[PDB]
A paper describes a structure:
The two Aro1DHQS chains in the asymmetric unit formed a dimer with over 1,100 Å2 buried surface area.
In the human fungal pathogen [name], [name] encodes an essential multi-enzyme that catalyses consecutive steps in the shikimate pathway for biosynthesis of chorismate, a precursor to folate and the aromatic amino acids. In Fungi and Apicomplexa, the second to the sixth steps of the shikimate pathway are supported by five enzymatic domains combined in a single protein known as [name] or AroM. Our activity and in cellulo data suggest that only four of [name]’s enzymatic domains are functional and essential for viability of [name], whereas the 3-dehydroquinate dehydratase (DHQase) domain is inactive because of active site substitutions.
Numbering used by the authors:
A (entry chain B): -2 to 348, 356 to 387
B (entry chain A): -2 to 250, 253 to 354, 358 to 387
C-alpha cells in the first residue's frame, strides 16, 4: 500500500513472505542482515538477466554486501530460459558452478525468476551439501502467488514433469510486483487463473474486488507499453490476497490436514487437460477451464448454485482466460491437438473414484475438503 | 530364521535396525508386512548380483510376495560397482528405470550393497517423486556398522565426494552378516577401522572383546577358504556392538556427541585425499586414529598406554598404524611421497571451511568432555612431523 511499502504474510508462524512494488533495496537488506553467510548466490535465466529490475537487485546486493559484510562474496549465474531447460543437466551445471566456487553449507541462494527457476534452483538448494538456505524471488504472477510458496521443488525428465525433487522450505519469499513490468501479456493473464482460484475457494470479498478491477487490469496488461505504476496498489493487493490464501492453507494443513487439497480447485480436470494440450496450452489457461468444469460438477451434484457457475465464468472471461476447450482463441493456441481431448484419456489422466474440490459458493468449498466422485459423474460434465 | 535369530537396535526410539546371520527370509517378511506397496525394487551392483546370498534374498522376496501380495510386483535393477559409478549418470539411470516401469510414490526400494549403493540408492529414494521409502541392506562390514545408519545419502561429482545428497532416514536397516561370506579380505579388514573406532570412543568392554577375538578373526578372514560360520556369533556381536554406538549417537537430542563418530577421520580424511584410490578409507582412518590418539596424549589428556593398546588392536585386525607400514607402502606406491604436513593441514582446513576440530580420546572407551575440541595447526604439525 501507500501506507506500507512492504506487506507480510505468515507461513507456519513466521512472516517470511514479503510483498511490495520496487523493493530490491529491502530484499537485499533483509537477506544480508538475517541470513549471515560467506557466500550469496543469485541464480536467474537469460530473459530475467536482461531486465532493468534484475540489474537493480544485483547492484543493490553488491553495494550493501560490500558495506555490511566485507569478507562475504556475491556470485551470480545464469541458465537458459524455458521448461525444456528444467532438467538434470541444468541442475548439474548450477551445482558444478557452486562447487568450482567453493560454496559450502553456509551458502545462501536466491532464485530470481518464474516457477521454472523457483522449482529448479529450489531443488539445487535442497540437495547442495544436503541442503542450504534458499530465498525465492518470483518474477511471474503465477510464481508470486503460487509456485514460490510451499516448498515443492523439482525438475523434469523426458518421461514427465516434476518427477525428481524435494520438499525444501524457503527462508524467505519476496514478491516484488515491479518485475511484472517486463512480463509478456499472455503469462500475466495465465497467472490470474490461480488468483481467481484462491478468491473462489476462500475469499468472496476479494473475488468482488477482482471483478471490479478486471477491466482496468486487462486494459493495462494488453496495451502496447503497459503502464503498471498506474495500477500499482491494486496489483500489490492482488498478489497479497492470493498468496495469503496459499500460505494460510499450507500453515493450517498442519492442524486440519486435507485443507491443503482445496488449493487443487480446477487442477483435477485442468491437469488432465494440460497433460493432453501442453505446451500449446499454458497451465493457467487449463486451470481456468478446469475450475468451470469442476464447478459444473459441483452444480450437477446439487451443491454449487448455477448462478455461482455463471459468476465464476464471467470473472475468468473478464481477465482474458478461456472457460471451455472450445473457446475461439484457445482453439487457435492448441490447433491440431484439440481433437486429442477425448473423455477416456481425461478419466485416465485423473486416475477408481476421483478426488475433486466441490465448490459450495463463491468464497467457500463444500465441507472444507476434497471429495471422491465417480467416473460416471465426471463423464456427465465432460460429455 | 525366527525371533531368536534377530538382534534389534533402536534409532529415534524405534527398532528399525535388525542384525543377524542368514536372515533373508526375515528381511522379506518384515518389508512385505510393514511396508505395504504395489511395487518393491531391489537395486544392487554387478559384484553382489552374482553371489548366492543375493539370489537367496531375491528368490525369497519373489516367492513370498506372490503369496502374500499377489497384485504387487518385484523389480530388480543393477548398476556397475566402483566409486567411479557413484555419480549423477547412475542416479539418473536408476530413476529412468523406475519411471519407465511406472513406479509411483508407494514404491519401496531396497539398496543391497556396500556404502556406494547405500548412499547412492538412498539418494535416489530421497528425491524420487520427492521421496519414497528406502530399506538399507548393507553388504560390507563398513556399511553394516556405519554407512547404512543415519540417513546421510549422496553421490560424487568430479570436484569431490558426497557433495550432492539428502538426509533421508531409511525405514529399516537389515544387517545380514552372511553377506560377508563373499567380501574380499581387504574390504573385510577395511571395515574393522570403524568397529575399532566405536569401541574406542564408547565401549571399553567391547574393545576388550575385540582384542580377545582379533587373532581368530584375522586367521579366518585371511585364509584361502574362509569359514565364517565357525565365528558366526562373534561376528554378529562385532556388527551389533559397533552399530549400537552409531545408532545411540544418531538418536541423541546432547548435540556434540555426533562429532565423536569423527574419531580418526580428521587426520584420516586428509591422508585419504592424498592416497585415494590406492588406499582405502578404513586403512587411512586406522592411521588417523593413531595420530589423533598421539595428539590427545601430546596435549596431556590420553595416557601413553592407550596409544600402545589401540595400536596393537588395530594391527591385530590387519590394519596399518603408520603411513610407513610395509604392506601399506605396497598398496600406495609413489603416492606416499606426496604425504607432506602442509597438504594434510590444507585438507583438514578445507574440510572445516564453513566452521580445525578433533576428537580427543581420554582413555579407551571414553572421549574427553564428550565433544570434539579445537586444535592448532602447530600441534597437528608437531604430531605429523
Ligand atoms: N512448486 C509448485 O507447487 C508449483 C506450482 C505451479 C507451477 N509450478 C511450476 O512452475 C513452472 C511454470 O512457471 P511460470 O509459469 O512462472 O513459467 P516460467 O518460469 O517458464 O516463465 C515463463 C517465461 O517468462 C520469462 N520470465 C519470467 N519472469 C519474467 C519477467 N518478470 N519479465 C520477463 N520475462 C519473464 C521466462 O524466462 C520464461 O520464458 C512449471 O515448471 C511448473 O512445474 C510449480
Ligand atoms: N552415509 C555415510 O554416513 C557414509 C559413511 C562412511 C562411508 N560412506 C560411503 O561408503 C562408500 C564406501 O562403501 P564400502 O566401503 O562399502 O565400499 P563399496 O560399496 O565400494 O564396496 C566395495 C566393493 O565390494 C563389493 N561388495 C560389496 N559387498 C560385497 C560382498 N558382500 N561380497 C562381494 N563383494 C562385495 C562392491 O561391489 C565393491 O567392489 C563411500 O562411497 C563413502 O562415501 C558413507
Ligand atoms: Cl538430484
Amino acid at each position: 500500500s501507500n501506507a506500507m511499502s512492504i506487506e507480510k504474510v505468515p507461513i507456519l508462524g513466521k512472516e517470511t513472505i514479503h510483498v511490495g512494488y520496487g523493493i530490491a533495496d529491502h530484499i537485499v537488506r533483509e537477506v544480508i542482515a538475517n541470513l549471515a553467510s560467506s557466500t550469496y548466490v543469485i541464480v536467474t535465466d537469460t530473459n530475467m538477466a536482461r531486465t532493468p529490475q534484475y540489474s537493480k537487485l544485483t547492484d543493490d546486493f553488491k553495494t550493501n554486501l560490500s558495506e555490511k559484510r566485507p569478507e562475504s562474496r556475491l556470485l551470480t549465474y545464469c541458465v537458459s530460459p524455458g521448461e525444456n531447460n528444467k532438467n538434470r543437466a541444468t541442475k548439474a551445471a548450477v551445482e558444478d558452478f557452486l562447487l568450482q566456487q567453493g560454496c559450502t553449507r553456509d551458502t545462501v541462494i536466491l532464485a530470481v525468476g518464474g516457477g521454472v527457476i523457483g522449482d529448479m534452483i529450489g531443488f539445487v538448494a535442497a540437495t547442495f551439501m544436503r541442503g542450504v538456505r534458499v530465498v525465492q524471488v518470483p518474477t511471474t504472477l503465477l510464481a508470486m502467488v503460487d509456485s514460490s510458496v510451499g516448498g515443492k521443488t523439482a525438475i523434469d525428465t523426458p518421461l514427465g514433469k516434476n518427477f525428481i525433487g524435494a520438499f525444501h522450505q524457503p527462508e524467505y519469499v519476496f514478491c516484488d510486483v515491479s518485475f511484472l513490468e517486463t512480463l509478456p501479456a499472455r503469462q500475466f493473464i495465465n497467472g490470474m487463473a490461480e488468483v481467481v482460484k484462491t478468491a473462489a475457494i476462500w475469499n468472496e470479498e476479494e473475488f468482488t474486488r477482482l471483478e471490479n478491477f478486471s477491466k482496468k487490469f486487462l486494459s493495462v496488461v494488453t496495451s502496447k507499453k503497459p503502464d503498471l505504476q498506474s495500477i500499482k496498489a491494486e496489483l500489490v493487493k492482488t498478489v497479497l490476497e492470493s498468496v495469503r490464501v496459499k500460505a494460510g492453507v499450507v500453515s493450517s494443513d498442519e492442524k486440519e490436514a486435507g485443507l491443503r487439497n482445496l488449493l487443487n480447485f480446477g487442477h483435477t480436470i485442468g491437469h488432465a487437460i494440460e497433460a493432453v494440450l501442453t505446451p500449446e496450452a499454458l497451465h493457467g489457461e487449463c486451470v481456468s477451464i478446469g475450475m468451470i468444469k469442476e464447478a459444473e460438477l459441483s452444480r450437477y451434484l446439487g451443491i454449487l448454485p448455477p448462478v455461482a457457475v455463471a459468476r465464476l465464468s464471467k470473472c475468468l472471461v473478464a481477465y482474458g482466460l478461456p472457460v471451455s476447450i472450445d473457446d475461439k482463441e484457445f482453439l487457435k493456441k492448441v490447433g491440431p491437438k484439440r481433437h486429442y481431448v477425448e473423455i477416456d484419456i481425461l478419466l485416465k489422466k485423473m486416475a477408481s473414484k476421483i478426488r475433486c474440490v466441490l465448490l459450495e459458493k463463491i468464497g467457500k468449498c463444500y465441507q472444507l475438503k476434497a471429495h471422491q466422485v465417480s467416473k460416471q459423474d465426471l463423464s456427465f460434465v465432460l460429455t
